Amino acid sequence: MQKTLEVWIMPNSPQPAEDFKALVAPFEKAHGVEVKVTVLDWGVAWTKITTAATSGVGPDLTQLGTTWVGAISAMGVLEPVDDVLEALGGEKAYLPAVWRTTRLEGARQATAVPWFSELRAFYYRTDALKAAGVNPAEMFASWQGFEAGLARLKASSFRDPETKAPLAPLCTPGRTPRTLHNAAPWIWGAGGEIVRQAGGRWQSALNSPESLEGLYFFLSLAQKGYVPAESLEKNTAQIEADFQAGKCAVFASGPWMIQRAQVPEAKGGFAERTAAKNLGVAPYPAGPKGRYTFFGGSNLALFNFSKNKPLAKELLKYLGGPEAQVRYAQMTGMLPALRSAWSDPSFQQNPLLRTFIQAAQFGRTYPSLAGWGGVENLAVQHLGMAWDLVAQGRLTREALKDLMDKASAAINQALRHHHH
């Protein structure tokens, strides 16, 4: 009789269950096991996972967002996977920002195996920068170059061949629960942080001088006319759609847009569009205190009530390992989490994907706190109010400071009270 393993995943790929079943079919055959997959919507998965964790009933493996690893690990419900990670090549096999997501911050044992990385870089219209007299090498080198490039893009008379209208210089979604990930590289490039250990415990640093310098630099680009009114009312998918449709000269996204530019609109791509034929990528520009690439993605964890921890760890080694890494990155439009897979020809032969791997060298993640969930909720609430002021042209350094002072009080309260 076939042995059984159960895995919970989120919708990472176009046919989530079918793709995952294709991914693991070789493992199934090699180990005489049927891997049962259950797909959870991103918005319901956290509660289903915490219900599994406290009830002691659930799958053998679950996908976790990198930002969830601290909270679940602090519940004491995850099997240590230092063995699996040593098998896959240890600390040196991962970018440091990815390695940080294998455990609760400061914890003795690893509780999650890196599966795939989300990262962000700037897509840009090669045609629009040429017409505006902007060298992408200079525009994406520094904050000064970035803003000077947007000023040249705003002044340009260039029109999209299909829309027959001007392009907005920069699009950024102002209506998203993931708004903190778009702010994070500006906070970081100014020498700031969302949280910092201050007198030995974690506190908000959103109201630090450096955090406020970075956030004002980014949010003030909208107030200067570089981001349209309508973008601040849109979500991540709607901004991708606006770039595909020729409305934006520059926007931040992940690697999946490259594949989408190769596929016809009938298959959900944008190969027919001017943007697909005039596509550039550059990493985030260097701020005054450094250059940082937002990293996220997903890991896999083993529940300590699993009835077959040895076979589950063979599946973690398979999913974390070279061949499965490349294949699942292709399926999902993400990067491999395993650093050795960044040298696969399927990343090396495409110049746009080579640029993503250059951006990956600056990768940075949030601290893996047990309380991260509450921190991010509160940060997003107050960043939402800051974007609201941007819409009215009423974001001053003082109004931003007042909002991040409110966020910091609330975050510090949440961090003190986190239940164990």
Ligand X SMILES: OC[C@H]1O[C@@H](O[C@@H]2[C@@H](O)[C@H](O)O[C@H](CO)[C@H]2O)[C@H](O)[C@@H](O)[C@@H]1O
* Interacting residues toward ligand X by CB under 6 A: 42, 65-68, 118, 296-297
- Select from Cl ion, ligand X, none the partner in contact with residue 173, using the beta carbon and a kind-dependent cut-off of 5 to 8 Å: none
- Site residues (CB under 5 A) for Cl ion, limited to 132-151: none
Q: Are strands 121-125 and 248-253 parallel, antiparallel or unpaired?
A: antiparallel
* Among residues 85, 170, 171, 194, the one that binds Cl ion under rule CB under 5 A: 194
Backbone conformation region of residue 201, classed left if phi is above 0, alpha if psi is from -120 to 50, else beta: beta
Which of 122, 123, 125 lies closest to 277, judged by CA?
125
State whether residue 39 is helix, strand or coil: strand
- What number of other Cβ atoms are within 10 A of residue 354's Cβ? 14
Q: Which is nearer to Cl ion, 8 or 188 (CB)?
A: 188
| Residue 193 interacts with Cl ion (CB under 5 A): yes or no | yes
Q: Report how many residues bind Cl ion under the rule CB under 5 A.
A: 2
- Select from Cl ion, ligand X, none the partner in contact with residue 320, using the beta carbon and a kind-dependent cut-off of 5 to 8 Å: none
Which of 30, 25, 33 lies closest to 4, judged by CA?
33
Say how many CA atoms lie within 13 Å of 224 toward its Cβ: 18
Q: Which is nearer to ligand X, 139 or 329 (CB)?
A: 329
Q: Which residue is nearest to ligand X (CB)?
A: 65
**Residue 214 Cβ, how far from ligand X at the closest point, in Å?**
20
- Select from Cl ion, ligand X, none the partner in contact with residue 296, using the beta carbon and a kind-dependent cut-off of 5 to 8 Å: ligand X
Looking at residue 393, the DSSP 8-state letter turns out to be T
**Residue 198 Cβ, how far from Cl ion at the closest point, in Å?**
13
- Select from Cl ion, ligand X, none the partner in contact with residue 65, using the beta carbon and a kind-dependent cut-off of 5 to 8 Å: ligand X
- Select from Cl ion, ligand X, none the partner in contact with residue 67, using the beta carbon and a kind-dependent cut-off of 5 to 8 Å: ligand X
356 backbone dihedrals φ, ψ, rounded to 5°? -55, -45
Residues whose CB is less than 8 angstroms from the CB of residue 182 and which lie 6 or more positions away in sequence, other chains included = 120, 172, 173, 176, 218, 252, 294
String of contacts with Cl ion for each residue 145-184, x by CB under 5 A? ----------------------------------------
- Select from Cl ion, ligand X, none the partner in contact with residue 363, using the beta carbon and a kind-dependent cut-off of 5 to 8 Å: none
Q: Report d(CA 28, CA 8) in Å as an integer.
A: 16
Q: Which is nearer to ligand X, 120 or 247 (CB)?
A: 120
- Select from ligand X, Cl ion, none the partner in contact with residue 68, using the beta carbon and a kind-dependent cut-off of 5 to 8 Å: ligand X
Q: Which is nearer to ligand X, 42 or 209 (CB)?
A: 42
Q: Report d(CA 87, CA 265) in Å as an integer.
A: 42
Candidates 38-46, 170-178, 191-199, 320-328 — which segment interacts with Cl ion by CB under 5 A? 191-199
| Residue 77 interacts with Cl ion (CB under 5 A): yes or no | no
Question: Please, are residues 248 and 242 in contact by the beta-carbon 8 Å criterion?
Answer: yes
> How long is the chain?
420
Looking at residue 347, the DSSP 8-state letter turns out to be H
Q: Report d(CA 98, CA 294) in Å as an integer.
A: 11
* Residues at the site binding Cl ion, with contacts judged by CB under 5 A: 193-194
